[PDB]
Amino acid sequence: AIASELQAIAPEVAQSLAEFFAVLADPNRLRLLSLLARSELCVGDLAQAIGVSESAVSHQLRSLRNLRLVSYRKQGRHVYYQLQDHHIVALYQNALDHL
Amino acid sequence: ELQAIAPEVAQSLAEFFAVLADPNRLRLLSLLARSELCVGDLAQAIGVSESAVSHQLRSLRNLRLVSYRKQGRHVYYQLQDHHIVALYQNALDHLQEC
């Protein structure tokens, strides 16, 4: 009934959103995000959980940091990574559940 | 005590996000996220022919991103499930500020 009052997202917004989803179209990134969706973790824990070197994980996390998919905090001699925000958690979980 | 998602699951999820990385598809989903709509409504909304939108919807139906229902003498399309609605809204919100 409200068809006449609806308009699609702007083209530039659709492009920006498409780019966001393209960044997530990476199984390796998703494996890392699946762990962070359940607990804040250091690179050491992430590396052992997946089965790769910490250097490998560190490299993958740099891209994720730059793309604002993950963030980190420092406490003592540890650096804990986590998902950027609750929106990332929600979209990840909803996508997984849809599948 | 933590295990990542299975390799096959990560791959399937990656493919799912890959099909969403399409501006034209997202424009259509952005409309359906607000309300179910007939092909006529969608075509006029984005400014293309009904045939064009019908073609695009064909792909979205097979990709399980949209579904449809018969309401009287018309067919209305909708997002496949609420998860699509929620992931779409959360992604857009993320790309925004407060």
From Swiss-Prot, chain B:
Q: Which residues bind DNA?
A: 39-58
Keyword check for Glycosyltransferase: no
Q: Can you provide one Gene Ontology molecular function annotated for this UniProt record? A: DNA binding
Q: Where is the HTH arsR-type domain?
A: 5-98
Keywords from UniProt, A to Z, are: DNA-binding, Metal-binding, Repressor, Transcription, Transcription regulation, Zinc
Keyword check for Isomerase: no
**Where is Zn(2+) 1 annotated to bind?**
D81, H83
- Source superkingdom: Bacteria
What else the UniProt entry mentions is: The zinc ions are bound between subunits, so that residues from both subunits contribute to metal binding.
Q: What does this protein do?
A: Transcriptional repressor of the expression of the smtA gene. Binds two zinc ions per dimer. The complex of DNA and SmtB is dissociated by zinc ions.
Q: What is this protein called?
A: Transcriptional repressor SmtB
Organism of origin: Synechococcus elongatus (strain ATCC 33912 / PCC 7942 / FACHB-805) (Anacystis nidulans R2)
Q: What is the lineage of its organism?
A: Bacteria, Bacillati, Cyanobacteriota, Cyanophyceae, Synechococcales
Name of the coding gene: smtB
Covered residues of the complete protein?
Answer: 24 to 121 of 122
